[PDB]
């Protein structure tokens, strides 16, 4: 967890992005005015002149943020296949204990959000990792662990004041529940609140509904896509 030199930040990049070695890498260090100590990399393909931007923490050399500025011409794989590849990528690159929270297809890309899961399975939605995958080949083209790496902290999570059964009665009568877990989200005013999270369908549309674990009141209702 020490500092790393600009040569070390280079090798992190090669491994994370599966670079073979013909890529020139232009690296920049954050100034003294900077809020965060980060190495800004601009990796250039020689074959095409496609550019990739990657940020790594000056301390500990953590993959913080990635963007391959590339438009995807063809969809060869399903969104579901992309989902699996994203999950595998995270596990292969030391991002463990994440679970998928959001998925969408946009401009021949799969866009995914994963969130931290505690030891006992509580989903910490603020502690998130965002991924964008090419649907042409399943490659990673965007990545952000800024929320996960910086908002993360050891929390001591309180006990619910209402049971999961009581929480479930707080749902609307038309909801068909398929799954329930405990979760931490912000309320509308940016403070962390413990909730029962329900995944279900309301008239064929899929919804995630959060019920406050102390009051039983709604905290968030979200339509999911598919």
């Amino acid at each position: 967890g020490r500092e790393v030199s600009e040569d070390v930040a280079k090798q992190v990049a090669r491994s994370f992005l599966n670079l073979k070695g013909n890529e020139q890498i232009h690296i920049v260090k954050s100034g003294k005015d900077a809020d965060y100590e980060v190495y800004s990399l601009t990796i250039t393909d020689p074959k095409t002149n496609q550019e990739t931007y990657m940020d790594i923490t000056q301390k500990g050399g953590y993959p913080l943020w990635v963007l391959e500025d590339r438009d995807i011409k063809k969809q060869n794989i399903s969104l579901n296949d992309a989902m699996n590849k994203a999950t595998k990528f995270l596990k292969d690159h030391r991002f463990e204990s994440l679970v998928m929270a959001e998925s969408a297809q946009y401009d021949n890309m799969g866009v995914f959000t994963f969130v931290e899961q505690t030891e006992s399975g509580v989903r910490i939605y603020p502690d998130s990792v965002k991924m964008k995958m090419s649907l042409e080949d399943g490659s990673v083209i965007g990545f952000s662990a800024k929320d996960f790496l910086l908002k993360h902290r050891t929390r001591d999570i309180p006990k619910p004041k209402i049971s999961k059964e009581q929480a479930k009665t707080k749902l609307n009568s038309n909801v068909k529940v398929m799954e329930e877990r405990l979760a931490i989200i912000t309320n509308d005013l940016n403070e962390e609140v413990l909730c029962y999270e329900f995944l279900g369908t309301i008239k064929n549309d899929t919804y995630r509904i959060f019920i406050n674990a102390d009051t039983g009141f709604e905290e968030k209702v979200e339509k999911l896509q598919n």
Side-chain angles (χ1 to χ4, degrees), residues 1 3-202 204-226:
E3 211 136 90
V4 302
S5 64
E6 312 188 23
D7 224 317
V8 170
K10 230 110 167 136
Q11 170 265 326
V12 185
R14 303 196 185 278
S15 200
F16 197 77
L17 297 171
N18 215 6
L19 309 176
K20 319 128 160 201
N22 55 35
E23 299 90 3
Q24 160 210 314
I25 311 183
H26 170 78
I27 177 167
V28 167
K29 58 168 335 175
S30 56
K32 18 193 72 165
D33 189 6
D35 297 328
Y36 295 97
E37 294 180 301
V38 167
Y39 296 103
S40 277
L41 287 62
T42 303
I43 301 121
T44 55
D45 188 345
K47 293 168 158 181
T48 70
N49 279 352
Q50 286 288 4
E51 298 183 43
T52 294
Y53 311 85
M54 181 166 188
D55 292 275
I56 313 192
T57 55
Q58 285 187 231
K59 69 178 330 163
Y62 267 96
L64 191 65
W65 185 86
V66 170
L67 183 55
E68 304 189 14
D69 189 28
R70 190 171 84 255
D71 188 68
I72 308 304
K73 309 299 169 193
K74 167 67 176 180
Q75 179 182 1
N76 288 320
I77 67 169
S78 63
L79 189 58
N80 192 45
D81 287 336
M83 296 180 187
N84 290 339
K85 292 193 168 61
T87 301
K88 176 193 183 39
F89 177 86
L90 290 172
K91 308 219 148 297
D92 290 343
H93 290 81
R94 284 168 25 195
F95 288 91
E96 321 296 329
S97 75
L98 292 167
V99 54
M100 185 173 50
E102 306 282 343
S103 68
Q105 168 168 353
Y106 197 93
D107 196 11
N108 291 339
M109 307 178 299
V111 181
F112 306 108
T113 303
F114 292 78
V115 298
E116 183 190 21
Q117 160 184 79
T118 69
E119 176 180 290
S120 70
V122 182
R123 286 166 194 191
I124 312 298
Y125 279 83
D127 295 13
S128 66
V129 177
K130 284 158 189 340
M131 306 197 63
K132 297 173 186 175
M133 314 294 289
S134 166
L135 298 183
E136 188 164 309
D137 55 18
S139 56
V140 179
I141 60 191
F143 174 85
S144 171
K146 289 176 83 159
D147 290 331
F148 180 66
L149 289 174
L150 301 172
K151 283 172 184 168
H152 186 277
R153 72 180 199 273
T154 179
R155 305 157 162 89
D156 168 66
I157 300 168
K159 198 174 312 252
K161 311 295 189 298
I162 72 175
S163 72
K164 57 159 140 291
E165 297 75 19
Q166 288 159 356
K168 187 167 164 162
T169 67
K170 303 314 199 200
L171 291 176
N172 283 345
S173 316
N174 40 345
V175 183
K176 308 309 175 68
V177 182
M178 297 157 23
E179 182 153 332
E180 174 280 319
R181 297 293 190 280
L182 280 167
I184 290 176
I185 64 171
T186 59
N187 54 18
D188 204 27
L189 285 210
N190 195 246
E191 293 180 302
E192 293 193 354
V193 164
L194 184 67
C195 302
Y196 291 98
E197 172 211 315
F198 296 93
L199 188 48
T201 66
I202 313 173
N204 281 21
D205 273 340
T206 302
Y207 287 86
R208 189 180 282 126
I209 296 150
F210 296 86
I211 297 303
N212 188 293
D214 290 349
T215 62
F217 303 149
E218 293 164 289
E219 292 283 3
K220 174 177 188 173
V221 175
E222 174 204 1
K223 181 163 57 150
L224 313 186
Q225 302 290 317
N226 159 79

